[PDB]
Amino acid sequence: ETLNGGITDMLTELANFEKNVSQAIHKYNAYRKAASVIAKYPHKIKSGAEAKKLPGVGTKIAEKIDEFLATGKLRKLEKIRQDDTSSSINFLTRVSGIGPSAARKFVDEGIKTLEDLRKNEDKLNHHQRIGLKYFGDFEKRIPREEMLQMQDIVLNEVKKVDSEYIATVCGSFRRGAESSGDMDVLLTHPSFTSESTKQPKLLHQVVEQLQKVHFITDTLSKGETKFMGVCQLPSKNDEKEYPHRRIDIRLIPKDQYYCGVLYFTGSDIFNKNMRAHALEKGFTINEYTIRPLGVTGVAGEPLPVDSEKDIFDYIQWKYREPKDRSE
DNA sequence: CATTAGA
DNA sequence: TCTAATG
Ligand SMILES: [Mn+2]
Ligand SMILES: [Mn+2]
Ligand SMILES: [Mn+2]
């Protein structure tokens, strides 16, 4: 957690690189497992040799560990850090729509900057086009303050369209968080579950609602169960307009809500931990359900859920307010 | 890890 | 169809 830090972070740097600037899936995969095992080890690594005893720790990485140990640095690391092309990739990459693939492609084409990308909006797609447009705003955080204002409106039309809806704005938001990166709306309806072969309109209806009113401003992607977009709070009585916000609404079979809800609400750790427990408690949890375990090794059969409580009751735990679902 | 775009 | 990008 800190005793083996530099080595971990170094490695991950090492790793993230092969994956992005290079196509080295494996090497990359390599650095990762190592970066992982080394992280687990209870002692201070004092030499490669030492590291080397480890699983996945080869001659290659160990060599790397020595240099870092020995001198507060690494050239390869230093060289990349400098590498304009490489740099370039990391950059283009913050463009929502922009992935390593495009990144490289763009690069090779000579498009290395924000401006470049502008100059050739043509060479970009709608997603990337939007991304382009709201680069600054997509990079900006979202004050809960807004989170509150946003939530409000959303719940408002949701309700207006059909009173039978159920929306929950999950994530860190839901978790108390002073700020968030985007808004996650979980969505369901009685008239939609496991078997009840859709009602795409279920989704449809709302986005359309949201739009009609000006909450939704763009479409990143709209599918029959997952919309992905951009929003903004009505820029008040002037002098102060609002930054463009990434928003995501999703349809869910009323029969799987709370799990999903539980789930997306995190924290990643909370979940893992709760989930770990459900194992002892003779259960199974995952993003959609909760199944009782059968000694044969495994088992099925989806226990009925109506609330975040059921799942809790199930595994006989303490109801954790989302506030304190931190871990 | 599943959904969406796109080509 | 596959391939990429988000989450
Ligand atoms: Mn070994
Ligand atoms: Mn990106
Ligand atoms: Mn998200």
The DSSP-derived string for A72-107 is S--HHHHHHHH-HHHHHHHHHTTSTT--HHHHHHHH
Q: Where in chain A is the domain with CATH 1.10.150.110?
A: 1-83
Cis peptide bond prior to A267, omega within 30° of 0:
yes
Q: How many CB atoms lie within 10 A of CB A273?
A: 13
Method by which this entry was solved: X-ray
Task: Identify the sign of the CA torsion A317, A322, A323, A327.
Answer: positive
Residues 115-174 of A with CB under 7 A from strand C: 131
Is A104 annotated as ligand-binding?
no
What CATH architecture does domain A1-83 belong to? Orthogonal Bundle (1.10)
- Rounded distance in angstroms from the CA atom of residue A23 to the C1' atom of nucleotide C4: 14
In the structure, how far is the CA atom of residue A237 from the C1' atom of nucleotide B1, in angstroms? Answer: 44
Asked if residue A95 belongs to a known ligand binding site, the reply is yes
How many whole angstroms separate alpha carbon A21 and alpha carbon A30? 16
β-strand partners of A219: A229
CATH class of the region A141-263? alpha beta
Specify the pairing of strand A245-253 against strand A226-231: antiparallel
* Maximum distance among all Cα pairs of chain A, rounded to whole angstroms: 66
Active site residue A140: no
**Residue A182 contacts strand C, CB under 7 A:** yes
The whole-number Å distance from A209's CA to B6's C1' is: 27
Catalytic residue among A40, A64, A236, A309: A64
Question: A195-216 burial, b if ≥16 CB within 10 A, otherwise e?
Answer: eeeeeeebbebbbebbbeeebb
Per-residue CB contacts under 7 A with strand C, chain A residues 85-114: 95-103
Residues A219 and A230: their CA atoms lie apart, in Å, by 7
Distances (CA, A) of A277 to A195, A201, A245, A272: 29, 38, 36, 9
Tokens 């005793």, located at residue: A3
Q: Where in chain A is the domain with CATH 3.30.210.10?
A: 264-326
What would the two tokens of residue A211 be? 């739009």
Query: Which amino acid is it at A236?
Result: K
CATH architecture entry for A84-140: Orthogonal Bundle (1.10)
Q: Which residues of A281-294 are buried (b: 16+ CB within 10 A; e: fewer)?
A: bebbbeebbbbebe
Pairing of strands A183-189, A245-253: parallel
C-alpha to C-alpha distance for A325 and A210, rounded to whole angstroms: 30
Domain with CATH 3.30.460.10 in chain A: 141-263
Tell me where in chain A the CATH 1.10.150.20 domain(s) lie: 84-140
| A83 annotated ligand binder | no
CATH topology of domain A264-326: Beta Polymerase; domain 3 (3.30.210)
Is A182 annotated as a binding-site member?
yes
Q: At what angle do helices A144-161 and A200-212 cross, to 10 degrees?
A: 120
Show residues, CB within 7 A, near nucleic chain B: A 125-127, 221-226, 228
Residue A171 in tokens: 């994530």
The SS3 of residue A58 is coil
Q: What is the resolution of this structure in A?
A: 3.2
Nearest residue (Cα to C1') for C7? A248
Give the burial string for A125-156 (b: 16+ CB within 10 Å, else e).
eebbebbbebbeebeeebebebbeebbebbbe
Q: Which residues, in sequence order, are bridge partners of residue A230?
A: A218, A246
Straight-line distance from the first to the last Cα atom of chain A, in angstroms, rounded to the nearest whole number: 17
